[PDB]
Design a protein around this ligand. Structure first.
Ligand code: MG
Ligand code: MG
Lengths: 361, 359
């Protein structure tokens, strides 16, 4: 990296305004012959909590939030994209408008940041950016691939799945994207499931004793008595009986097999806990469920709590092991022994590189 | 002028998922020291819910000052009881809220904090039944009729009705009390995640649940149909939460003669879009009205006709959901009258706290 990279290269700011927090990235890049970004490098990152949608939108609270997120950035005289995801999608457009009206005003009140767009993106666009960001980092975009790379993003309020699929006129145009990048033509199936992110899904199982460690105090006064296969079946009812994940996804994946799966989001944080044993930043769903069942679900809560003081989400590890299995295996139909790569959480790889690439197509 | 110079007074705060409600009640007591002549002498309602604020001294001070500072009466005992909004957080995160709140009360002299805690859904249901029945004057003597109460919240819903003590049901779902010389045994149940905010977050991309052409968040269009929306919501009620399996056998054996409901349903039934007489509805009518007055309407047209109702966009979903809960979940006949307490009365479960602590 150069000293003062934005005096030597193009730079752009992209803000991921997710359900659990907002993440500013500033990227330097160069461009090739088509003015498409290459050599994308993150030169600044700042993550804040809580999520944008969780604040009361008024001039004071928006100024405080945006100052916290942006003020200390090393460079401000650059284009900014503020793209909110599933947290804002939980609100009707009428309620979201207050937020963007205050946000727009704040940007127009200052003279450095160059706001390009501030909006809530659909889960389908978020999926598209998920796939581009991961494939950029894998360096699979430059050339036509021998194998199919699928991406899953596990968020707080939505989950996305995205994989290559030729154009299919029987499938909604909203769930398909054709792009041309680096002179290659790519057709993807995209899908997002709102309500199936970890925070929203969890709020339907907090009184399920099979979903918590033994003796964990459930909110309505019963005790945990964890059993991951049992908890997973409860979560599968939400996946399939309610959202119809399997009916929508499995027929398409059967016909458009994915050779390598990469996942980003909460699953990376779970799989990185010392309660689990994984190698090479990959897991299988069978191993995740069995480890969660044995090391959390059937263990005593007060012991676990004192033993893992740094795992903030420890109380949900039995649930979350069961939930990722329910989603991937019973929902998407992925084999429980199939390798799932998870991107290390220290990489802070979200979908925002996707925006850098996609705005110039 | 100041009733608390001549009568006992206490303050009870309902800290719900969507806001907090301060009530100050004056009362006398009978010869068992049970409250009688309960009168509300002050109310203040604020939003948003306590569990939604960031828990630090600055934020907690602003919230509690807004809730309490302008009350005409202080120097009285305060019970702060939170419900399903705080239940959605682990104890470790809840503790930060209560440590800050505790500090705020210790740092002032006008309010006497007695207890600040999250109550279970079962306790909330008990207080639901006592509050409503106190207001109906059905507690003073043995009733010909079984009165059941439903509380429709943002994050949980409760149901509670009389049921003789049963060794085969969890002790946590049964309450025995002795009040005004009578012995009353209730079944209580709360369903966390089935309140209207939490439920709705599983159905925002269901076209059947929104008016025609309503823009769903993931880019598809509404195409409302209340019976179809109700079927979707029923799979959450019964395939996920097993409401039918848990409640229907018990109501079959313990029929309720009169149902009373509080919470969001009162707001929906009282709205400009729905038409009910005598503060009562039937589920059959509720579903039909939602279907024809919202679901099958064109969104931009209807939105422009009814600008002053923030929940208009959810009315197709809400009418479908209450039917799914009451009919497909609890087993209530679609033609059975459901009384709803008018939203103007601000009747929540807090009178139940006034009564219960003397029992
Ligand atoms: Mg995200
Ligand atoms: Mg309530």
């Amino acid at each position: 990296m150069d000293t003062n990279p934005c005096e030597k290269h193009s730079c752009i700011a992209v803000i991921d305004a997710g359900s659990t927090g907002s993440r500013l990235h500033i990227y330097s890049y160069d461009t090739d012959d088509t003015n498409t970004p290459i050599h994308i490098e993150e030169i600044w990152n700042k993550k804040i909590k809580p999520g944008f949608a969780s604040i009361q939108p008024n001039s004071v609270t928006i100024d405080a939030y945006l100052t916290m997120l942006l003020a200390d950035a090393p460079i401000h005289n650059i284009p900014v994209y503020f793209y909110a995801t599933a947290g804002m999608r939980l609100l009707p457009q009428s309620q979201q408008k207050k937020y963007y009206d205050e946000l727009d005003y704040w940007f127009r009140q200052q003279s450095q940041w160059q706001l390009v767009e501030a909006k809530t993106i659909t889960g389908n666009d978020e999926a598209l950016f998920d796939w581009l960001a991961v494939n950029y980092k894998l360096d699979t975009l430059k050339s036509v691939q021998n194998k199919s790379v699928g991406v899953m993003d596990m968020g707080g309020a939505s989950v996305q799945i995205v994989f290559p699929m030729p154009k299919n006129a029987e499938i909604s145009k909203h769930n398909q994207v054709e792009l041309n990048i680096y002179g290659q033509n790519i057709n993807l199936y995209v899908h997002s499931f709102l309500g199936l992110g970890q925070t929203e899904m969890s709020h339907q199982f907090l009184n399920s004793p099979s979903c918590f460690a033994n003796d964990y105090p459930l909110p309505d006064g019963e005790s945990g008595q964890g059993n991951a296969p049992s908890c997973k079946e409860e979560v599968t009812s939400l996946m399939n009986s309610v959202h119809k994940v399997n009916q929508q996804i499995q027929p398409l994946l059967a016909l458009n097999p994915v050779n390598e799966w990469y996942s980003i989001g909460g699953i990376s944080n779970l799989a990185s806990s010392q309660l689990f044993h994984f190698e090479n930043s990959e897991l299988t769903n069978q191993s995740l469920l069995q480890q969660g069942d044995n090391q959390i679900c059937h263990q005593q809560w007060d012991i676990l709590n004192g033993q893992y003081p740094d795992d903030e989400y420890l109380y949900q590890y039995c649930l979350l092991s069961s939930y990722y299995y329910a989603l991937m295996v019973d929902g998407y139909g992925i084999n429980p022994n199939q390798t799932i790569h998870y991107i290390p959480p220290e990489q802070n790889l979200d979908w925002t590189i996707g925006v850098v690439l996609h705005r110039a197509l």
